[PDB]
DNA sequence: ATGATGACGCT
DNA sequence: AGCGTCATC
């Protein structure tokens, strides 16, 4: 009882941008605002494949992966922006540069872990403590939290949704332990007020809206962020967890969306995250290994110790192109040419990274695929990255793959290549 | 025939 | 080192 760790030691937030790429396109072209639209890659094949969808467009059933032409059946008025194309390949710099905008603002509040192009985790333990001293044990006005939901409230003994939001908010705030500094619920609340600030800062300074989750760890924060999208934040407290997890499908938890999660269901015969609490740490370890068993044991009780890593920049930089079906590469003459195009973009990206961030990459990973094989990568080989020269990298990248070419006939390339991937890594200070 | 990323774990 | 998983970058 008194020596049980309840995982209330930190305050963590996850901020993720709403329909990010679409927002970037809509800030640029006002015609796309307040309209079902989507962001698209390579117009030729079926209007291009959709990679981002506005919320107005989601109301018609339009989804990522979907071809635009199919998407226009569900929603004839759908507007598209296209990804910039630069060497017969998609160039994402617009959305990288837009992400930096966001990460720099967030970096002003707390040290962030960049988790993707449009999302970072934040550790607010310090900012909350330091802010608790500044408020003179005064209450927290509801006006400090104009977009916050409290998961599981209102409960106990106004139909429209802002009505409920306020009701849970007041119920929560009315019940608060302002006298106690180390009350975890009070901490989450201060954290939440800071995130209102962060988010109001992001929008003022970029015009981009986001949602956020606030909890005691990265996995709850992540989960919480999804609960009230778009343009809202959610607080998931320790106490809400049993009810939240009691009907939460296991696959909704980060790192259980794939096969490990599939086997937790199949082995244990359960559907929901709360059903894991009926199993011992030893039982869980026997089934899924020591590291998973322990992590699962804790997680279903809302406890997770994975830290918010101080890393605003990427640790690898890379470019891939897929050559599906008919298009697969079957002449060394065109393997060169694509390795050159890739290497060119990479060099563009690398030299920028060297001046911006004061670091140089030192290793060049070269991956490829071959026709028939249905695994992201067939093989993967490293070599030194001594110089930011596209012709040298692409040559080196070629050198590192011929072996694989089964062709006795010299001009050709067998079997054909379904994908080329080049990636800079082993960074070092510069 | 979504395609283009990136982090991390296991051996 | 090189392969595999996870997520969504
Ligand atoms: N498989 C994917 C997933 C995402 N993205 C890009 C486009 C998205 O705009 C952005 C962020 O993706 P999210 O999965 O966070 O989803 P969105 O931000 O598009 O919308 P939301 O997060 O509001 O659901 O990353 C992509 O190119 N390919
Ligand atoms: Ca997003
Ligand atoms: Ca995201």
XYZ file of C-alpha atoms (C1' of nucleotides) and ligand atoms in Angstrom:
480
model
C 0.000 0.000 0.000
C 2.346 2.777 1.255
C 5.332 1.307 -0.703
C 3.514 0.960 -4.053
C 4.735 3.175 -6.903
C 1.720 4.728 -8.703
C 3.685 6.454 -11.519
C 2.651 9.989 -10.617
C 6.167 11.331 -10.396
C 6.246 13.166 -13.756
C 4.076 15.377 -15.927
C 4.297 14.561 -19.625
C 2.519 15.988 -22.641
C 2.247 14.974 -26.248
C 1.477 17.682 -28.801
C 0.553 16.602 -32.315
C -0.527 18.871 -35.143
C -4.000 18.563 -36.661
C -4.027 17.319 -40.304
C -0.532 18.689 -40.466
C 0.381 18.660 -44.179
C -3.095 19.935 -45.096
C -2.681 22.810 -42.621
C 0.639 23.692 -44.297
C -0.998 23.805 -47.695
C -4.003 25.817 -46.388
C -1.848 28.460 -44.751
C -0.125 28.852 -48.154
C -3.284 28.803 -50.270
C -6.287 30.406 -48.464
C -8.630 28.844 -51.061
C -8.132 25.473 -49.255
C -9.229 26.733 -45.809
C -12.506 25.471 -44.293
C -12.903 22.956 -47.098
C -12.686 19.234 -47.615
C -9.187 18.885 -49.008
C -6.243 16.453 -49.046
C -2.520 16.325 -49.715
C -1.401 14.003 -52.493
C 1.683 12.296 -53.927
C 2.296 11.632 -57.641
C -0.732 12.761 -59.758
C -0.390 10.180 -62.578
C -1.429 6.907 -60.849
C -5.135 7.321 -59.992
C -4.902 11.038 -59.195
C -2.080 10.425 -56.702
C -2.114 8.676 -53.326
C -3.522 10.598 -50.334
C -1.169 11.248 -47.371
C -3.206 13.805 -45.379
C -6.949 14.652 -45.109
C -8.793 17.697 -43.724
C -11.475 17.174 -41.053
C -14.218 18.453 -43.410
C -13.070 15.785 -45.919
C -12.980 13.059 -43.234
C -16.752 13.593 -42.783
C -17.121 12.075 -46.318
C -14.999 8.945 -45.588
C -11.726 10.055 -47.192
C -8.689 8.428 -45.702
C -4.928 8.157 -46.021
C -3.676 5.422 -48.518
C -6.765 6.012 -50.696
C -6.165 7.090 -54.351
C -7.458 10.595 -55.110
C -9.781 9.333 -57.892
C -11.434 6.958 -55.488
C -11.471 9.775 -52.940
C -13.403 11.984 -55.443
C -16.189 9.394 -55.567
C -16.937 9.811 -51.864
C -16.421 13.571 -52.030
C -16.693 15.204 -55.534
C -15.897 18.711 -54.138
C -12.514 17.590 -52.651
C -9.622 19.955 -53.244
C -6.050 18.598 -53.557
C -2.619 20.072 -53.003
C 0.314 18.113 -54.440
C 3.588 17.362 -52.787
C 6.506 19.162 -54.469
C 8.342 16.723 -56.768
C 12.083 17.219 -57.315
C 13.946 14.425 -59.011
C 11.027 12.409 -60.115
C 10.487 12.025 -56.374
C 8.460 13.610 -53.599
C 10.272 16.390 -51.696
C 9.018 17.027 -48.195
C 11.104 20.123 -47.283
C 8.034 22.357 -46.951
C 6.693 20.172 -44.104
C 10.137 19.775 -42.466
C 10.586 23.551 -42.466
C 7.033 23.906 -41.098
C 7.853 21.393 -38.303
C 10.960 23.344 -37.246
C 8.684 26.383 -36.799
C 6.648 24.287 -34.346
C 9.516 22.536 -32.546
C 11.361 25.809 -31.885
C 8.315 27.351 -30.145
C 7.753 24.202 -28.055
C 11.486 24.205 -27.225
C 10.930 27.539 -25.450
C 8.820 25.949 -22.744
C 10.561 22.721 -22.032
C 13.085 20.334 -23.430
C 11.283 18.260 -26.045
C 11.569 14.847 -27.644
C 10.780 15.189 -31.338
C 8.772 12.006 -32.019
C 7.759 12.638 -35.652
C 7.567 15.507 -38.145
C 4.396 16.845 -36.477
C 4.698 15.620 -32.845
C 6.921 16.068 -29.797
C 6.734 14.829 -26.234
C 7.296 17.309 -23.407
C 8.425 16.797 -19.781
C 6.787 19.524 -17.668
C 7.658 18.361 -14.133
C 10.041 21.298 -13.661
C 7.894 23.947 -15.339
C 4.900 22.833 -13.222
C 6.857 22.935 -9.904
C 8.371 26.306 -10.777
C 4.868 27.569 -11.753
C 3.225 26.170 -8.570
C 5.516 28.462 -6.473
C 4.513 31.465 -8.629
C 0.759 31.002 -7.986
C 0.207 31.931 -4.333
C -1.843 28.785 -3.556
C -4.550 30.561 -5.623
C -7.185 28.530 -7.479
C -7.110 27.639 -11.176
C -9.825 29.525 -13.049
C -11.667 27.535 -15.716
C -10.677 30.412 -18.002
C -7.078 29.181 -17.816
C -8.189 25.908 -19.502
C -10.570 26.959 -22.359
C -9.874 23.810 -24.504
C -9.158 21.101 -21.892
C -11.219 17.864 -21.431
C -10.914 15.790 -18.247
C -11.220 12.164 -19.313
C -14.016 10.399 -17.395
C -15.772 13.657 -16.312
C -18.498 14.648 -15.868
C -19.637 11.591 -13.881
C -22.126 11.101 -11.034
C -25.488 12.817 -10.295
C -26.759 20.299 -21.561
C -26.530 17.849 -24.489
C -24.022 19.731 -26.716
C -20.343 18.988 -26.436
C -18.851 22.226 -25.068
C -21.526 21.842 -22.351
C -20.101 18.530 -21.123
C -16.515 19.829 -21.445
C -17.197 22.617 -18.927
C -19.144 20.329 -16.589
C -16.283 17.848 -16.246
C -13.857 20.783 -16.024
C -15.793 22.385 -13.141
C -16.308 19.029 -11.377
C -12.567 18.469 -11.594
C -11.562 22.002 -10.598
C -14.101 22.143 -7.744
C -12.594 18.937 -6.313
C -8.951 20.155 -6.485
C -6.291 19.801 -3.717
C -4.716 23.322 -4.069
C -3.444 23.193 -0.424
C -1.165 20.216 -1.349
C 1.823 20.992 -3.660
C 2.762 17.379 -4.430
C -0.828 16.342 -5.314
C -0.368 14.732 -8.732
C -3.801 15.859 -10.006
C -2.952 19.484 -9.277
C 0.305 18.995 -11.197
C -1.457 17.625 -14.294
C -3.745 20.656 -14.017
C -0.813 23.153 -14.011
C 0.769 21.195 -16.842
C -2.498 21.577 -18.698
C -2.536 25.392 -18.274
C 1.022 25.518 -19.662
C -0.021 23.424 -22.702
C -2.926 25.872 -23.337
C -0.162 28.492 -23.481
C 2.141 26.434 -25.727
C -0.700 25.715 -28.108
C -1.913 29.330 -28.130
C 1.705 30.315 -28.869
C 1.985 27.785 -31.711
C -1.190 29.046 -33.359
C -0.472 32.768 -33.012
C 3.061 32.341 -34.348
C 2.264 29.821 -37.213
C -1.495 29.703 -37.745
C -1.339 25.955 -37.047
C -3.710 24.231 -34.656
C -2.937 21.096 -32.661
C -4.279 18.758 -29.994
C -2.476 17.583 -26.880
C -2.482 14.925 -24.180
C -1.336 15.585 -20.597
C -0.588 12.719 -18.211
C 2.268 11.191 -16.110
C 4.006 9.383 -18.943
C 4.463 9.224 -22.715
C 1.974 6.467 -23.413
C -0.972 8.056 -21.583
C -0.092 11.451 -23.017
C -0.159 9.915 -26.521
C -3.466 8.108 -25.874
C -4.997 11.207 -24.296
C -4.083 13.443 -27.219
C -6.292 11.345 -29.507
C -9.381 11.509 -27.312
C -10.541 15.007 -28.277
C -9.278 16.010 -31.709
C -9.177 18.462 -33.403
C -7.952 21.587 -31.687
C -8.528 20.454 -28.056
C -6.381 19.055 -25.206
C -7.112 16.183 -22.867
C -5.975 15.510 -19.290
C -5.717 11.775 -18.385
C -5.169 11.446 -14.634
C -4.050 8.353 -12.739
C -7.618 7.841 -11.365
C -9.343 7.861 -14.771
C -7.215 4.933 -15.918
C -9.188 1.885 -14.691
C -12.358 3.022 -16.446
C -10.462 4.328 -19.501
C -8.575 1.036 -19.872
C -11.567 -1.204 -19.052
C -12.919 -0.738 -22.595
C -9.721 0.470 -24.291
C -8.718 -1.992 -27.037
C -5.141 -3.113 -26.467
C -4.130 -2.092 -30.062
C -4.744 1.568 -29.207
C -1.708 1.624 -26.882
C 1.636 2.659 -28.349
C 3.809 -0.368 -29.300
C 0.799 -2.755 -29.110
C -0.620 -1.738 -32.492
C 1.402 -4.524 -34.234
C 2.157 -8.269 -33.666
C 3.195 -8.240 -29.948
C -0.274 -6.835 -29.232
C -1.865 -9.404 -31.526
C -0.241 -12.184 -29.482
C -1.275 -10.601 -26.165
C -4.813 -11.002 -27.406
C -4.277 -14.533 -28.837
C -2.252 -15.919 -25.854
C -4.173 -14.359 -22.942
C -7.593 -14.393 -24.658
C -8.426 -10.756 -23.726
C -9.630 -7.645 -25.712
C -8.972 -4.594 -23.503
C -6.086 -2.958 -21.768
C -7.517 -3.338 -18.198
C -7.741 -7.123 -18.435
C -3.898 -7.270 -18.126
C -4.096 -6.388 -14.372
C -5.274 -9.956 -13.561
C -1.810 -11.311 -14.508
C 1.401 -11.461 -12.493
C 4.638 -9.843 -13.645
C 6.169 -13.382 -13.779
C 3.231 -14.722 -15.904
C 3.506 -11.849 -18.354
C 7.294 -12.241 -18.544
C 6.929 -15.984 -19.179
C 4.715 -15.165 -22.215
C 6.272 -12.040 -23.738
C 9.786 -11.923 -22.235
C 11.185 -10.079 -19.220
C 11.227 -6.578 -20.710
C 7.715 -6.778 -22.163
C 6.222 -8.612 -19.178
C 7.414 -5.919 -16.795
C 6.445 -3.060 -19.080
C 2.986 -4.656 -19.664
C 2.524 -5.324 -15.925
C 3.067 -1.626 -15.131
C 1.374 -0.167 -18.246
C -2.094 -1.636 -17.629
C -1.963 0.057 -14.185
C -1.079 3.340 -15.983
C 2.593 3.174 -15.033
C 5.368 3.618 -17.610
C 8.908 4.866 -16.981
C 10.192 5.586 -20.541
C 11.767 9.050 -20.460
C 11.232 12.182 -22.565
C 14.549 12.218 -24.359
C 16.157 15.585 -24.978
C 16.461 15.414 -28.786
C 14.972 18.128 -30.995
C 16.906 16.846 -34.072
C 16.871 13.580 -36.069
C 19.603 10.956 -35.744
C 19.377 9.714 -39.355
C 18.638 11.416 -42.686
C 17.416 9.455 -45.678
C 15.709 9.267 -49.067
C 13.829 6.348 -50.582
C 12.107 5.649 -53.845
C 9.853 2.711 -54.643
C 9.641 1.314 -58.175
C 6.572 -0.943 -58.010
C 5.417 -3.497 -60.620
C 6.293 -2.703 -64.276
C 8.580 0.173 -63.246
C 11.211 -1.888 -61.348
C 14.776 -1.095 -62.395
C 16.450 -3.710 -64.678
C 19.470 -1.954 -66.212
C 22.606 -0.835 -64.361
C 22.344 2.325 -66.450
C 19.194 3.407 -64.513
C 20.240 2.064 -61.103
C 23.102 4.603 -61.357
C 20.687 7.332 -62.344
C 18.289 6.861 -59.405
C 21.156 6.395 -56.909
C 22.370 9.716 -58.314
C 18.987 11.414 -57.867
C 18.694 10.120 -54.285
C 22.294 11.068 -53.469
C 21.654 14.535 -54.866
C 18.637 15.210 -52.573
C 20.605 13.714 -49.664
C 23.523 16.016 -50.207
C 21.129 18.997 -50.442
C 19.664 17.908 -47.095
C 23.047 17.031 -45.502
C 24.839 20.354 -46.256
C 21.868 22.254 -44.818
C 22.015 20.096 -41.728
C 25.764 20.796 -41.350
C 25.325 24.593 -41.307
C 22.095 24.599 -39.297
C 23.043 22.080 -36.631
C 26.862 21.953 -36.501
C 27.175 18.214 -37.186
C 28.373 15.951 -39.958
C 27.164 12.399 -40.750
C 29.840 9.672 -41.049
C 28.123 6.507 -42.328
C 26.045 5.817 -45.441
C 23.530 3.051 -45.277
C 22.414 1.744 -48.643
C 19.310 -0.405 -48.746
C 17.493 -1.931 -51.683
C 14.662 -4.286 -52.553
C 14.283 -6.845 -55.328
C 11.122 -7.968 -57.143
C 9.115 -10.781 -55.462
C 10.465 -10.257 -51.935
C 7.623 -8.662 -49.857
C 9.771 -7.283 -46.997
C 10.424 -3.460 -46.768
C 14.153 -4.213 -47.289
C 15.786 -7.170 -48.988
C 19.329 -6.160 -47.969
C 21.154 -3.253 -46.296
C 24.868 -2.362 -46.451
C 26.936 0.446 -44.858
C 30.031 2.285 -46.110
C 32.024 5.364 -45.048
C 30.490 8.764 -45.625
C 33.609 10.855 -46.052
C 32.170 13.759 -48.138
C 28.890 15.478 -48.975
C 29.183 14.771 -52.729
C 26.218 13.177 -54.476
C 28.336 11.622 -57.248
C 30.690 9.995 -54.698
C 27.925 8.700 -52.407
C 25.962 7.322 -55.384
C 29.115 5.742 -56.766
C 29.961 4.279 -53.307
C 26.363 3.150 -52.984
C 26.640 1.410 -56.335
C 30.000 -0.231 -55.457
C 28.347 -1.594 -52.293
C 25.698 -3.316 -54.509
C 26.686 -5.440 -57.558
C 27.198 -8.737 -55.818
C 23.352 -8.908 -55.641
C 22.980 -8.485 -59.424
C 22.675 -12.093 -60.660
C 23.108 -11.048 -64.324
C 25.796 -12.792 -66.385
C 24.682 -10.410 -69.174
C 26.547 -7.233 -68.275
C 24.368 -4.248 -69.321
C 21.238 -5.589 -67.529
C 20.267 -5.955 -63.888
C 18.663 -9.126 -62.502
C 16.482 -9.482 -60.582
C 14.854 -6.049 -60.903
C 14.977 -3.507 -58.016
C 11.631 -2.516 -56.434
C 13.210 0.076 -54.076
C 16.319 2.174 -53.450
C 17.025 3.731 -50.002
C 20.106 5.810 -48.971
C 20.520 7.081 -45.443
C 23.091 9.233 -43.608
C 23.938 8.226 -40.057
C 26.619 8.070 -37.288
C 26.490 11.837 -36.798
C 29.353 13.712 -35.119
C 29.975 17.329 -33.904
C 31.209 19.882 -36.506
C 0.314 0.121 -57.061
C 0.174 4.308 -51.119
C 4.935 5.962 -50.925
C 8.299 8.234 -47.918
C 10.056 8.458 -43.831
C 12.391 7.689 -38.910
C 13.355 5.273 -33.946
C 14.752 1.349 -31.575
C 15.417 -3.804 -30.308
C 17.466 -8.344 -31.125
C 21.341 -10.961 -32.397
C 26.846 -5.285 -38.600
C 22.363 -6.516 -40.557
C 17.799 -7.766 -40.017
C 12.884 -6.867 -37.959
C 9.179 -4.143 -35.600
C 6.497 -0.113 -34.805
C 4.496 4.151 -35.980
C 3.307 7.623 -38.825
C 7.991 11.131 -40.343
N 1.524 7.255 -43.247
C 1.739 8.604 -43.205
C 1.338 9.264 -42.059
C 1.529 10.633 -41.934
N 2.092 11.342 -42.926
C 2.286 12.796 -42.814
C 1.059 13.540 -43.302
C 0.403 14.048 -42.049
O -0.175 15.317 -42.281
C 1.528 14.136 -41.042
C 1.179 13.799 -39.606
O 0.476 12.563 -39.587
P -0.514 12.129 -38.412
O -0.572 10.620 -38.500
O -0.154 12.942 -37.194
O -1.976 12.650 -38.866
P -2.349 14.120 -39.413
O -1.543 15.126 -38.698
O -2.446 14.121 -40.928
O -3.844 14.273 -38.857
P -4.294 13.991 -37.333
O -3.004 13.771 -36.585
O -5.071 15.258 -37.004
O -5.186 12.778 -37.419
O 2.478 13.168 -41.451
C 2.470 10.663 -44.096
O 2.987 11.312 -45.025
N 2.295 9.317 -44.224
Ca -1.092 14.875 -36.579
Ca 1.584 12.698 -35.489
